[PDB]
């Protein structure tokens, strides 16, 4: 090809886009900080040292990089900086006003009321009278929270008790009273090109509770009625347009309550934790190639037109340790070669520390499988893990 793509970020979770760009014949430039993932840097042709979370620094550093496009994936760290790169170097991608709107819940929820997108509605209250005014356009239960540094409220007596406790602790003169939506949490992937949403793919979200709920697995297909699947397609398409997202892969956090779905979060980049790999399994496509080709002002539809007519099930899980800590000797994988095993990769090596799982950086590795159904995936996955031995010495 002979085309230059700057990829913002070079962590272990971003080597798929570096690999795809190489397979396409693209000259990659790793936009990163001194210490990053070595296999990404060994895939990258160039390295440009930059803080990708600083849109102003980034804008300066790209003028002399001779780029054809720019891309980010699996993280929000450099999502605004990408948007500015595209707005100033006139490269294909999301625009900065859309990236800001996604990033700011007040601005996002303002667009969703205007464009009538299902979401947990909120009011920026300043007094006991504004609380009750806000409560007439809000369904209970509600959360009372501060913006600078939560109080769940089932009934009115817990709401004032919450507002008074919040306003004394916060440094601001205001509070946020927001609808508390409790229900089935899930996500979705989407892709927008020239203002046409190619798809909306709902997906399951497996999690591990320690401090917060850590994402530890994803799967397709989501076990819901087809009416929930179509309701998700509807709200995501509405949200994409409410916020003005375009020429980007999209990652969404949904919630299902009483046969109605709501958008919690929406970002103009692909999701992490093997979600691009589950898009690839589910449609039988090359989705990092669609991302990379779009970035460099080429047509992603070349790859979308080779999709399968069937939807295979996929399951991706992080390998974690929950009742053991130590220094690693070796990881024993006694599993046989199988085309239904998409990936088995380990992140730790001899003399690395195995930390009793608390956050995402404590993952030992990851497994990806595909099969006719999710029950066959899960059974296949249980056999894999049971043939994975982590030795501490």
């Amino acid at each position: 090809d002979n085309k230059r793509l700057l990829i913002l970020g070079a962590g272990r979770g971003q080597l798929g886009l570096y690999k795809a760009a190489k397979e396409l014949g693209i000259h990659t430039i790793a936009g990163t900080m001194p210490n990053a993932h070595k296999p990404c840097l060994n895939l990258a042709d160039e390295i440009s040292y930059m803080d990708i979370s600083n849109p102003d620094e980034v804008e300066q550093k790209v003028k002399d990089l001779n780029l054809d496009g720019a891309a980010t994936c699996c993280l929000d760290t450099g999502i605004v900086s990408l948007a500015r790169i595209c707005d100033k170097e006139n490269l294909v991608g999301l625009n900065e006003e859309a990236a800001i709107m996604c990033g700011d819940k007040y601005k996002m929820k303002e667009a969703f009321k205007k464009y009538n997108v299902n979401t947990a509605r909120h009011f920026v209250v300043r007094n006991e009278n504004e609380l009750k005014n806000a409560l007439e356009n809000l369904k209970l239960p509600v959360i009372v929270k501060a913006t600078d540094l939560i109080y769940i409220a089932k009934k009115e007596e817990e709401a004032i008790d919450g507002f008074n406790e919040t306003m004394n602790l916060t440094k601001r003169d205001y509070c946020i009273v927001e609808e508390f939506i409790e229900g089935y949490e899930f996500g979705a992937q989407a892709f927008v090109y020239k203002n046409d949403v190619l798809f909306v793919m709902p997906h399951g979200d497996e999690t591990y509770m320690s401090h917060t709920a850590v994402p530890v697995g994803h799967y397709v297909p989501l076990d819901v009625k087809d009416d929930i699947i179509e309701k998700t397609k509807t709200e995501v398409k509405k949200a994409i347009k409410a916020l003005g997202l375009n020429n980007c892969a999209v990652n969404v956090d949904m919630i299902l309550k009483d046969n109605e779905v709501y958008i919690i979060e929406l970002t103009g980049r692909v999701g992490a934790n093997c979600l691009p790999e589950l898009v690839e399994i589910n449609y039988g496509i090359e989705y990092y190639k669609m991302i990379a080709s779009m970035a460099i002002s080429e047509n992603p539809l070349v790859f979308w037109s080779q999709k399968s007519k069937e939807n295979k099930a996929g399951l991706a899980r992080m390998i974690i340790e929950t009742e053991k800590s130590g220094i690693l000797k070796e990881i024993l994988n006694s599993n046989a070669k199988d085309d239904d095993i998409v990936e088995i990769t380990f992140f730790k090596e001899e003399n690395d520390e195995i930390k009793k799982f608390e956050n995402s950086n404590d993952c030992i590795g990851q497994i990806i499988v595909k099969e006719e159904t999710l029950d066959k995936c899960k059974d296949k996955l249980d056999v894999i893990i049971n043939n994975i031995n982590i030795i501490l010495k």
Side-chain angles (χ1 to χ4, degrees), residues 52-105:
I52 72 173
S53 69
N54 192 356
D56 274 276
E57 187 206 89
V58 163
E59 183 208 323
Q60 269 35 82
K61 287 182 180 280
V62 301
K63 266 285 174 200
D64 300 276
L65 291 180
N66 243 80
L67 310 179
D68 288 295
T72 194
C73 102
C74 298
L75 228 54
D76 290 325
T77 315
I79 195 48
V80 169
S81 321
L82 173 55
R84 204 170 284 175
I85 288 158
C86 301
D87 283 15
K88 303 299 182 87
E89 296 293 319
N90 197 36
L91 309 181
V92 168
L94 80 174
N95 65 52
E96 200 176 5
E97 55 182 345
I100 291 266
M101 205 159 223
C102 288
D104 193 62
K105 275 224 166 294

Side-chain angles (χ1 to χ4, degrees), residues 10 18 22 28 30 36-47:
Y18 283 94
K22 198 175 193 210
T28 53
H37 209 237
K38 292 170 213 279
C40 293
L41 300 189
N42 292 309
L43 281 161
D45 298 38
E46 221 160 300
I47 308 179

Side-chain angles (χ1 to χ4, degrees), residues 213-329:
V214 184
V216 303
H218 290 287
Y219 60 90
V220 288
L222 187 65
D223 186 54
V224 289
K225 301 294 208 103
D226 300 324
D227 185 43
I228 307 313
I229 298 289
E230 294 312 301
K231 274 170 185 161
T232 294
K233 283 170 185 182
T234 290
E235 294 317 287
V236 167
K237 283 183 185 81
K238 281 163 69 176
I240 282 160
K241 205 143 211 283
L243 296 166
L245 280 83
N246 194 27
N247 301 331
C248 64
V250 176
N251 179 68
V252 201
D253 301 325
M254 315 283 315
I255 181 147
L256 156 68
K257 179 174 177 175
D258 305 331
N259 288 309
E260 280 306 332
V261 304
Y262 304 85
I263 298 180
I264 303 150
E265 314 292 356
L266 196 135
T267 169
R269 51 84 194 166
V270 71
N273 310 127
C274 308
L275 288 160
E277 288 75 15
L278 296 173
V279 182
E280 285 179 334
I281 286 161
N282 185 258
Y283 295 109
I285 59 168
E286 296 180 278
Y287 191 53
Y288 291 112
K289 283 189 180 175
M290 285 167 64
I291 291 168
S293 69
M294 191 166 53
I296 64 162
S297 213
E298 293 302 330
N299 195 3
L301 297 171
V302 159
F303 307 96
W304 180 241
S305 64
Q306 301 306 313
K307 71 166 276 185
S308 291
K309 290 268 208 180
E310 292 139 359
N311 303 132
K312 203 134 195 170
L315 174 60
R317 278 192 188 154
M318 305 310 107
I319 303 170
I320 61 157
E321 179 60 61
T322 44
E323 281 280 294
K324 214 170 188 175
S325 287
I327 311 118
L328 186 67
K329 175 179 126 187

Side-chain angles (χ1 to χ4, degrees), residues 15 38 191-192 194 267 313 379:
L15 63 62
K38 292 170 213 279
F191 190 98
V192 55
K194 297 173 165 272
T267 169
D379 293 344

Side-chain angles (χ1 to χ4, degrees), residues 78-133:
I79 195 48
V80 169
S81 321
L82 173 55
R84 204 170 284 175
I85 288 158
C86 301
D87 283 15
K88 303 299 182 87
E89 296 293 319
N90 197 36
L91 309 181
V92 168
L94 80 174
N95 65 52
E96 200 176 5
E97 55 182 345
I100 291 266
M101 205 159 223
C102 288
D104 193 62
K105 275 224 166 294
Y106 309 93
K107 286 182 208 275
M108 200 199 59
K109 299 262 194 233
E110 193 190 40
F112 292 181
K113 60 156 48 173
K114 183 193 170 179
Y115 287 96
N116 190 26
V117 167
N118 293 350
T119 198
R121 298 173 298 172
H122 75 89
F123 280 100
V124 274
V125 52
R126 272 163 186 184
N127 45 70
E128 289 236 353
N129 298 95
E130 276 176 49
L131 190 54
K132 296 146 190 173
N133 170 34

Side-chain angles (χ1 to χ4, degrees), residues 20-40:
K22 198 175 193 210
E23 284 184 284
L24 290 173
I26 297 177
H27 181 100
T28 53
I29 299 130
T32 183
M33 225 45 200
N35 315 132
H37 209 237
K38 292 170 213 279
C40 293

